[PDB]
Design a binder for these strands. Structure first.
Ligand code: NA
Ligand code: NA
Lengths: 99, 90, 96, 97
DNA sequence: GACCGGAAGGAAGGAAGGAAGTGCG
DNA sequence: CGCACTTCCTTCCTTCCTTCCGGTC
């Protein structure tokens, strides 16, 4: 998170969301974990530039997001296009598991 | 694992498969001259014989973001291969 | 020898060996061609069999995809959750 | 050169002679090299050390333990792309206190 | 129906890293 | 024992689709 002091994708997003100077490509839509991609093409490019993977597009990025469904990090907001919600309870388990 | 674009240019070089696909100029502008037949071969080759143009076109409509090919705006079954896009992957 | 740690190929064969585990995974062919009827279950079982929580099919399948290069097993091109065990690789291993 | 051959040596042995470009060669005058056939490099390495089970996956692991030793680097993004750290091989042959 | 693209999911395989096991020295 | 790996996974992806649409053309 902001206490992750390689870069995971779910972190890369929170990094941008925190500084709302990057609101031109992505920002929040309701503070209850609900965020929305304003320029998915731009989001992918940055994540590409980061990983030295300039061919990286939403098409390939999207896949990586939808792997966080079984391992609960984030969720799909039904219908709402480009809308995903973070499972805070899920990341807490991942970051501090209780056997 | 052979890609889709590789499979297309397999049967465009050999014009003995002109019953399925052919050229409309050497400007990277080919023509899908038997969509139903075109769909069968990919499915048969991939062990996925349920493949139709509907699902196959989606695969070719993921080639827009990736500068590999595009559509001939309006014209039917007419897609333009990026010959400066294949050179990038050579 | 297979005394040190349980190998994944050995982990899967321990369940389909008999039944009662047929609900999540079982055989489909004499060659083998086993099929996972509930991969979500199989993942959890292997994830608790080795005491490794946060285990899914993706992480499991990746390990079974490394088995291609070694020639331990082969995948049935197209068929969903379909893999066939290769006698060649397992013969070379086993006790030696 | 400065000649149980170690792995980091085995690769540099091949890069010298331009006849081994088939499987591995240079890609820049900054110690950058690509494995043009990793499966081939593994086969030669499995024969050399006499470990015929050898692949790229296990070969690579050894090269990714070299990161901690500061022997070589991952050329980020580029496929099969690794680069030697000249600084962290002088430390091995001339460990200065 | 062609033709378009989001979204949910298989499937190959590179790359980073823990962890026990293997000789060799 | 200390080194230098080797063996075998987890882990997290990038990559190329297959499938299923709803929706415009
Ligand atoms: Na699932
Ligand atoms: Na690195």
């Amino acid at each position: 998170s902001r206490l992750a002091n390689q870069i995971q994708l779910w972190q890369f997003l929170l990094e941008l969301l925190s500084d709302s100077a990057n609101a031109s490509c992505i920002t929040w839509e309701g503070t209850n974990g609900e965020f929305k991609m304003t320029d998915p093409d731009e989001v992918a490019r940055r994540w590409g530039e980061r990983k030295s993977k300039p061919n990286m597009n939403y098409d390939k990025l999207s896949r990586a997001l939808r792997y966080y469904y079984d391992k609960n990090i984030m969720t799909k907001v039904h219908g709402k296009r480009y809308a995903y919600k973070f499972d805070a309870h899920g990341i807490a388990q991942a970051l501090q598991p209780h056997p």
